[model samples]
Target chain A: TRIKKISIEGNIAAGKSTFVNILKQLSEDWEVVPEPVARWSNVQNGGNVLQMMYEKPERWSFTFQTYACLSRIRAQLASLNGKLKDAEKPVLFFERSVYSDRYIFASNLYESESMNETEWTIYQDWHDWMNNQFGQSLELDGIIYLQATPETCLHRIYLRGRNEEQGIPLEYLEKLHYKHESWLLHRTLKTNFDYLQEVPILTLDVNEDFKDKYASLVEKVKEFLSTL
Target chain B: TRIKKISIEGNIAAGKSTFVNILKQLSEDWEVVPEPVARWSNVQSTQDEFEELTMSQKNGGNVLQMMYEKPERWSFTFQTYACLSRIRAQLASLNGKLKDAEKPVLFFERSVYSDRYIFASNLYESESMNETEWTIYQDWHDWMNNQFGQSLELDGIIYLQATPETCLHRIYLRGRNEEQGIPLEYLEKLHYKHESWLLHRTLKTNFDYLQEVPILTLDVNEDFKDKYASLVEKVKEFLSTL
Candidate 1:
């Protein structure tokens, strides 16, 4: 019996949360692991690292990203350590995985120069070391990437009206979109070394509304999950 | 001329600050680099992490305190990362200022070597850091040292030798808010670790970059008021040789 561990990934406001919620509503048996947003906000009881990063980015960029990496690692460890009683029908779904957090978000921050040279080098070293240590254990069955244009993502982010996201520029989203494409589509996702298994990804071009493609998306997810 | 970088290392409350201050007062030519305590305390926009840690100890809301209490909770990762950042930033600042130094000796409160061998190694041995965490830390430390360690070579180290009890007594006399409630056992462990690293130069503490530097051990059990001049004279003689 194979345990299905899946992750939903996309750029900011690309409907990752909504997609995860819909998948949960459609299938009761799916074990859903939400992103560690709340944990990032309430770190050490009341430290809002997410807000601090956005509000005072120059001061908090390195600090926030470091904590973010730790949170993502914890989430990965929890999902891996979790026991599934029904081995015959085991499926663990996560909103995002540690790989995206490093390859996409932290990489974006480093490229943008938000993190200094020393900070960036330390972060990359830790990320590589961690992948070498625990990447094998977090072998994902599949990744559901909600592919969308940067324009659409920006519009959806505006509609969402998150206070901390008010200052997000279009160029930031554009760069992130390019990064996601390069990682998920353009390049073959290889492990740190070449000995580990390659992660399979399912890219759904979600340019249209979720309501317009609900039935087809459900069917697609089910078909992909069944093969896993 | 070769630049001389000397590290002043000792157990907690081992009169490191007093000795550094006296050195500054004694010689106008000695360039002193203080520890990154101010940066650690004011990490983010006036947020004092040390105070927050103390407050959290009482009311339970500080990240540093939480990391100390629950080492398995990924707090070790954050704390260690922060330590590396602080150490690098301080070293970079000193490098930038060294060109303008009026003095020949660049005395630092603590060096990157001590951060790794003394503090981080303790965290690993005490089970505060897992094997993966320790490996990650070691890799980063080695890489950073390779990148910048050549320029920051030490001429000698002024190791202030004192017993754990004597250090603990000095800590109480100073009476800093954060230094309150520090356990004697913790001081004893640190004293032993410092002794092992500075006196014995064990493999764990014999860092590659430090293999060539000599060490000047000074007995700090006596009060600085009585030993300041002699200690300064000894340090001056050592630097003269360098």
Candidate 2:
């Protein structure tokens, strides 16, 4: 039997995490690797890097983004290395991947001038190096993109009320939304320069309330997983 | 009368501070601008952006101490940026205070050129900053230099030459909390960087922005008490020519 590896990707508050959690609960044969948020929060004696980044972006932008890149790479490496030797789970689902960290979030930060040009260039070099180092070993089966509008994401974020996300403006999410579209759907010049390997994408519109559409979303994901 | 700005550049514990202090006392007319180490240490009361970065309960903890103690936790890119800001503030303050003075010679503890060529570049080469991060730092540094920093010209730079071991010994004698556990290897790297930037003059990437000022090298491995008078004389002669 072939093993399948897929990453759940989207903008902030786009239902990616919740959808992954549901899939984890429903599918007993699939192994799930969630985002390393806890690790980033508790890094080096309980430093909340995420919170610090949102509060004062000018001071913490490069620091937070650099650590974010390293942490995501570590998570992906761990998942790839955890492939069982003797007949294990048929599928592996990741909360996110290193690819999205560079191609999506890092790109957004640079484009918005939240991170300066030098920082963006340095980040690009590191991403290219890391990709060259580990690209061949950690190939993905597919990417499950939870397509959501910036407005929808903002509404959900406000509903959930995470304190660190209080200062995150709508314009930021709007810019991130365009970046996601440009990379995943439009396949623009920037992503072409990125040189990431082509992978299958299962795009699902997640603009509506997840509570009302949970069963249908699960069916769609299960159907997609069936193809693999 | 034109204002002459000079910088004192050297390795850690290379007697740059002592030399600058002596220059301050010897030349009453020369305006001395010290390094902003105190501002970095007392950031909480100042309400600087760095106040949000620390884990201390007190309002007067040192961010530099935290950085030296655990560099793994702090990012060199941010620290370098903060240093640039602090240096700019000092330079601006000096400019404002001496705007109406009579042919004042301003002496700085360090310069923005040294910050980029020596300290930040050392951090990048030491793998504290990855390649992309280095590129970002260089871009900002170049832009800053071209835009506003070009106006701040130097008449001369007093380069204090000292070996890594000599610097380490002096650093140990001073015993600042942040610099308590500084490794000899770190000092060695910075020493080579300073040598390359000042003595060798081969580290610059941007040629057009380079300042063609003279550099006076003073060997400070021995006691300054014996050499202070002659050193002051040399500086006075240099300033007279400027």
Candidate 3:
């Protein structure tokens, strides 16, 4: 059989890293695919994509956003080719997926008016093109959503001093939470254009401590993967 | 200011042509876009370009004529051409000034959205096209609509909702050779596709473009002649809202 894939997604500072790290320690039968943070940080020789996007969102969002989508697609493709495609590790866990990029971040950008009409058209065209070009390989078995409230996310954001994220407001986190809620929880199109299918999504409430959540998560993921 | 546009849709032989014909006599402002039957009939050298078609596709077969006869062979190609032709007709029908608000409503025989959801989608669901072809078709459909911008956006959808039996009888009476061969089983699926789109709206991924477009579902059952005036009142009320 092919590698069973699932995307572990959540709000910023929703303890996704902690969840993945624990999952990694517990299972030798599965491998964790990390998001390409290093590429974003030092993409083209000292130029930081997130830094530019954070500093001047209106001007550079099209550039940073499109490039980010490409990088994620590349990351997804990379995970499929090899790395941990052994008999021992038959399953793959992606820290983030292109669904997060398309249904979450890029959608928010367009909805909040960060990306203009022409820019959105260009971005969405490419986004659709990539999904069509890649087809079902890009789509995975399930989605593990680390559900957290905006207030909790902001508190954790404050706890972790990722300098670039220091200036993010509570309202912005609230908006992102709304997106997560709409996509994973209600499965509605509060956004302008909503497109998706019947993929299983697991909501792991990450408001409590990560130590407490691990046992339940391990049980849930096994059941989820078995269905796949 | 832009031209008002609406799609008049129904099951096959559901009196769509008659509706358009009556509307033509009633008003001079609107233009009725007849289905591109002639265009679909004469697709010469077009299918020749695709290397895949070089295998078994013959020339001058009357694509629409063969679609019902050999759906498995031509469903993908027929659907692709139909979608493109519908998009072209929509563009051509609305060729008047984009800024011309004074123009009457632009009524197309069918909308490209239904071409995707009702017709093209049912073909894919029934396994007429493989998975890859279906995905490519959808991508092209959405991408092209994105380029169409507001020009493709529907002001309203006048759904002449009719039953499959109602349509089947009309098919027998209307006596068009291509449509006569269209079996009861086939029109039933198309009817479901139509009902699912306009009335039920259960298929969430199907009709994103119809999000804001108002739909007027008029049941054209056996009581058609009795309530024509009330139906006019209902339709007039709907148009006023639009």
Off by over 4 Å in 1: A188-197, B1-79, B82-242
Interface RMSD, candidates in the order listed:
13.8, 14.5, 16.4
Tens digit per residue, CA lDDT, model 1, B5-88 = 788999888888777876876655566777755434333322144566665422212334334556565344445655554455
Number of clashing pairs, model 2? Answer: 5
DockQ of each: 0.04, 0.04, 0.02
Q: Which 10 consecutive residues of model 1 chain A have the lowest summed lDDT?
A: A188-197
Candidate 3, superposed: residue stretches over 4 Å from native:
A1-228, B44-59, B97-103, B206-209, B223-225
Q: What TM-score, to 2 decimals, does candidate 2 have? A: 0.52
Fraction of native contacts, model 1: 0.03
At residue A173, what lDDT does model 3 achieve?
87
| Model 2 bad stretches (over 4 Å) | A1-228, B45-61, B207-211
Question: Each prediction's TM-score against the native?
Answer: 0.53, 0.52, 0.48
CAPRI grade of model 3 = incorrect
Quote the B-chain TM-score, candidate 1. 0.82
lDDT tens digits by residue: candidate 2, A143-181: 888888888888888887877787788999988888778
Candidate 1 vs candidate 3: the lDDT winner is 3
Q: What lDDT tens digits, residue by residue, belong to model 3 across residues A157-215?
A: 77988777888889888888888888888877533222344778888888887566568
Candidate 1, residue B232: the lDDT equals 78
RMSD of each: 15.5, 17.2, 21.4
CAPRI tier for the interface of model 1 = incorrect
Tens-digit lDDT track of model 3 for B46-79: 2223455557544444667766777765565566
